[PDB]
RNA sequence: GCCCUUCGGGGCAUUUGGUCAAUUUGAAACGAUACAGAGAAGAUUAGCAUGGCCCCUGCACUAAGGAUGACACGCUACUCAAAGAGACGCUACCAAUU
């Protein structure tokens, strides 16, 4: 489970983790470092910004380590998706087409815009203005379309 | 970026949003202090209401309480006369003790 266990409960990790333990506890260690950053100079959805970065980054090692540069076993990924080590959901449609750069979930998530729309991060930077500079107020993404 | 191609081309995906993170000048309120100071025609007071540009506590916007919760207590011509009886009213002002 990815509830805490005692110790004496605890099963090893499958193979290839000892590998790879150190860009996880990396990535582990940047989540603390945004849990602890200063919120006073920066607005508020600023403050939220970090973690989904973070989470982008780490679920983008996984699904990079096994698609792409194959070095784990299908075993691992799929106890790594299952342990929260990445976003499952993120790197389903990181497999879609259309969406190989997605920053979030949250950014195709239409039924919870306005006009349900998605968010302009997704819009091809060749359809938008010149120099003009989106930080989508979810992510914090400033373009995600496959085309960027 | 990926995919397809008949290598000319075509496809997949499509417009977020919370006035800034900044406290003098776009609106917080007690308490302390100062002061005064509790209804019903003598004195003392159980209350229940009434009306709303007065509200408070309460789930009660179909209880109850808040001094009977308070407020109430100033002010005061205006649909408006008629009868009959008066008026040096409406003008003048005036000549003997012995
Ligand atoms: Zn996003
Ligand atoms: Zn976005
Ligand atoms: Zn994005």
Same mark, same amino acid.
């Given at each position: 489970?990815?509830?805490?266990?005692?110790?004496?409960?605890?099963?090893?990790?499958?193979?290839?983790?000892?590998?790879?333990?150190?860009?996880?506890?990396?990535?582990?260690?940047?989540?603390?470092?945004?849990?602890?950053?200063?919120?006073?100079?920066?607005?508020?959805?600023?403050?939220?910004?970090?973690?989904?970065? %973070?989470?982008?980054? /780490?679920? /983008?090692?996984?699904?990079?380590?096994?698609?792409?540069?194959?070095?784990?076993?299908?075993?691992?990924?799929?106890?790594?998706?299952?342990?929260?080590?990445?976003?499952?959901?993120?790197?389903?449609?990181?497999?879609?087409?259309?969406?190989?750069?997605?920053?979030?979930?949250?950014?195709?998530?239409?039924?919870?815009?306005?006009?349900?729309?998605?968010? %302009?991060? /997704?819009?091809?930077?060749?359809?938008?203005?010149?120099?003009?500079?989106?930080?989508?107020?979810?992510?914090?993404? /400033?373009?995600?379309?496959?085309?960027?």
């Amino acid at each position: 489970m990815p509830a805490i266990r005692p110790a004496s409960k605890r099963k090893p990790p499958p193979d290839g983790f000892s590998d790879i333990e150190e860009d996880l506890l990396i990535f582990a260690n940047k989540m603390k470092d945004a849990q602890n950053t200063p919120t006073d100079n920066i607005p508020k959805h600023q403050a939220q910004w970090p973690i989904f970065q %973070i989470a982008h980054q /780490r679920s /983008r090692y996984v699904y990079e380590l096994y698609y792409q540069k194959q070095a784990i076993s299908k075993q691992l990924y799929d106890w790594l998706l299952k342990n929260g080590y990445a976003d499952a959901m993120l790197i389903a449609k990181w497999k879609k087409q259309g969406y190989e750069k997605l920053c979030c979930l949250r950014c195709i998530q239409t039924k919870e815009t306005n006009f349900n729309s998605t968010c %302009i991060c /997704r819009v091809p930077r060749a359809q938008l203005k010149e120099d003009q500079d989106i930080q989508c107020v979810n992510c914090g993404c /400033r373009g995600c379309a496959s085309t960027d």
